[PDB]
Design a protein around this ligand. Structure first.
Ligand SMILES: Nc1ncnc2c1ncn2[C@@H]1O[C@H](COP(=O)(O)OP(=O)(O)OP(=O)(O)O)[C@@H](O)[C@H]1O
Ligand SMILES: Nc1ncnc2c1ncn2[C@@H]1O[C@H](COP(=O)(O)OP(=O)(O)OP(=O)(O)O)[C@@H](O)[C@H]1O
Ligand SMILES: [Mn+2]
Ligand SMILES: [Mn+2]
Ligand SMILES: [Mn+2]
Ligand SMILES: [Mn+2]
Lengths: 277, 7, 277, 7
């Protein structure tokens, strides 16, 4: 099936239920990246649990097929399935993620940040026109090619919403979580959440590029969550001194607690930071 | 590093 | 200070507030591993936040100095401090972590598992005699040397308890968390927790080596936490079929919800699995 | 992968 067509190489990355490796296509001798997903739960899960994970994986593949073709989104080339594993073959990105890049440069400039955010907002605008929420936006899920162009990946928690539908689950990566998803977990009489969670996360990304660290970074998780819930953050000490007031205005429109008042992708691309007159 | 989760 | 004595190389690992790199000692030309900790919070934290992180780091160094000398614990060689960073120089472990090892072999045998667990329990027994709790036991924090001997590391959340003292904070890695720490977060009138959380985590480690996956592995975090709280797990389908009833008995004595009934390190080393007569 | 956290 997959091992008769491809040859497995080294580990490029790892997830909760997946391992990402470099692989050679036997026929053409070209290199690709393969996500190996274990639906059986490492050693063993229940049949119910297995079906939940098999249905989550098929929705991932579905969104990947719908968004195919966009120049700044990763391309899924070929999928394979067995009773325990799923194999998703993707284009290989040699310069890795935006997280690795940030680690080497510590902080990025206002000009380099405008480049990346203009591309990222364009992708978000496209997805939201189709009613799709990514739901896991972060530096580790944004890859770079040889020309340093961004390529969005990991659509594992993604959803295409129906007219009227709202999501109720608590999922994501802790320091990028919007406050409405955390609100959802403390009150079972909450209305739900929608596409707006992606804009908060976008804001966390943008602040982290410019300052070197995340806006709501704290040692104790309980206080981190209280800080994100109240929107307690700041552009402090010497760090943000070199930066204009326009970038800071844009970041603060993303970091708004009430989702109905938060900026959208369309509105963010119209801001003076990307130009206005 | 930080991974994703499901409650 | 640190850059005048050592030369920095590649990234070997990354944490929430730290980056671990390979480095050459200028004078002797020998290779070491250096943990770079940012107390300033990436770009910027508050003065309060900074002092909390600076005091957490100094306690880490303290425990590292107290436990120094044990053959199966990592050795801290040299520390450096500035206003924003902390530099902790350690012995370099070329074969990496037990997590990377597990990924390549998928599952380990009963005999290979007896080797690792006998060593790990010995270290835990030593620490608990000194009243020290590690509080973050997991495959990513257990390193291996050239002879494949285990070396315990990452004492970032560790504590030496006073006569009578109990801990009240919620910290660790989600799928290895004992139920008493999760109980602590839902009821502010709980008595606290102690050294017993390390034994639960030890149990999660042991099951994960043998089966290939963690005992309480589920897609939705809310149900994962309910599963760990109730102790709902199983030795299912074909996975555990090859294994004896003695290993399974030992794992189930670790995975006990009531901490007063849970096995200790001393008791675990006396079990028939490691020998009895 | 999984990282550590503080509430
Ligand atoms: N196409 C690719 N080319 C190169 N490296 C890749 C590619 N896809 C993924 N990787 C790497 O592997 C990692 C894991 O992939 P992915 O994000 O899809 O896994 P996951 O299990 O869904 O992770 P997460 O914990 O975020 O949910 C990424 O962080 C990235 O570094
Ligand atoms: N002495 C060492 N030699 C080689 N590699 C090392 C060494 N120490 C650490 N590493 C690697 O770097 C990683 C991170 O180190 P460490 O666990 O101390 O960081 P951390 O920030 O405390 O991580 P965590 O998220 O678990 O809290 C480890 O998982 C390991 O792979
Ligand atoms: Mn990912
Ligand atoms: Mn994912
Ligand atoms: Mn660690
Ligand atoms: Mn740690």
């Amino acid at each position: 099936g997959f091992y008769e067509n491809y040859e497995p190489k080294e580990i490029l990355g790892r997830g909760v239920s997946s391992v990402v490796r470099r692989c050679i296509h036997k026929p053409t001798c070209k290199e690709y990246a393969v996500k190996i997903i274990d639906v059986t739960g490492g050693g063993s899960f229940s049949a119910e649990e297995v079906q939940e994970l098999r249905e989550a994986t098929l929705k991932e593949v579905d969104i990947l097929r719908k968004v195919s073709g966009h120049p700044n989104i990763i391309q899924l080339k070929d999928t394979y399935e067995t009773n325990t594993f799923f194999f998703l073959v993707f284009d290989l990105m040699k310069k890795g993620e935006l997280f690795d890049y940030l680690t080497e440069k510590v902080t990025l400039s206002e000009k380099e940040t405008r480049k990346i955010m203009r591309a990222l907002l364009e992708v978000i605008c496209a997805l939201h026109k189709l009613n799709i929420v990514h739901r896991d936006l972060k530096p580790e899920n944004i890859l770079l090619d040889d020309d340093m162009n961004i390529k969005l990946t990991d659509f594992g928690f993604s959803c295409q919403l129906d007219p009227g539908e709202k999501l109720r689950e608590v999922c994501g990566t802790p320091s990028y979580l919007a406050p409405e998803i955390i609100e959802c977990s403390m009150n079972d009489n909450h209305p739900g959440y929608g596409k707006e969670v992606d804009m908060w996360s976008t804001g966390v990304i943008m602040y982290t590029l410019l300052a070197g660290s995340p806006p709501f970074w704290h040692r104790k998780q309980m206080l981190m969550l209280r800080m994100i819930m109240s929107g307690n953050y700041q552009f402090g000490s010497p760090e943000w001194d070199d930066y204009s007031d326009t970038v800071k205005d844009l970041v603060s429109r993303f970091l708004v607690v009430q989702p109905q008042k938060r900026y959208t992708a369309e509105e963010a691309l119209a801001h003076p930071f990307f130009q206005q007159y | 590093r930080q991974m994703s989760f499901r409650l």
